[PDB]
């Protein structure tokens, strides 16, 4: 009878997560490229990584920023610090109220305004600026499941 009871009995598993975390940055660069590589080619473990290991897209922990609660992928060229930080990524305003995002260090080079829209001078000269600082206010969180 005990076997019949335990055949269709529920194993209840509660899980609790406790943790405090604060992070302040101004560019959200990547730090995983500083840590020693293990003998099997994987970077050593730290408490600051954003993760992101993917074998389908070839992503690695070194391709993503590690500060704030953002995992902003690192940008090549002069937008990012030549593959070391996040891109500048101005924003562009349009007459019809729509907006788009230019990814470059010089907004004058925005060679693709779509045919029917015009840059309304709403930003500095119609070109805004996506803020580069990320912040995670200090807070300890308890997660129950």
């Amino acid at each position: 009878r005990i076997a019949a009871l335990e055949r269709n009995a529920f194993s209840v598993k509660p899980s609790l997560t406790i943790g405090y975390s604060v992070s302040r940055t101004s560019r959200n660069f990547d730090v995983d490229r500083l840590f020693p590589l293990n003998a099997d080619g994987t970077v050593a473990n730290n408490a600051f990584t954003s993760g992101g290991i993917d074998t389908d897209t070839g992503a690695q922990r070194r391709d993503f920023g590690d500060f704030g609660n953002a995992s902003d992928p690192v940008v090549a060229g002069a937008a990012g610090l030549y593959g070391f930080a996040d891109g500048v990524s101005y924003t562009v305003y349009f007459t019809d109220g729509s907006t788009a995002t230019f990814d470059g260090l010089n907004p004058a080079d925005y060679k693709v305004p779509t045919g029917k829209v015009i840059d309304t001078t709403k930003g500095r000269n119609g070109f805004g600026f996506n803020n580069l600082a990320r912040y995670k206010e200090g807070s300890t969180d308890i997660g129950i499941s």
């Binding site: 604060v22 560019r27 500060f67 500048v88």
Partner: peptide, 23 residues
Amino acid sequence: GSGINNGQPARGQTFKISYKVNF
């Protein structure tokens, strides 16, 4: 670095208190 062009390096700082509990 810190591409608002104010002549300052990009900086980052983090503090974590971690605690793993099991029921």
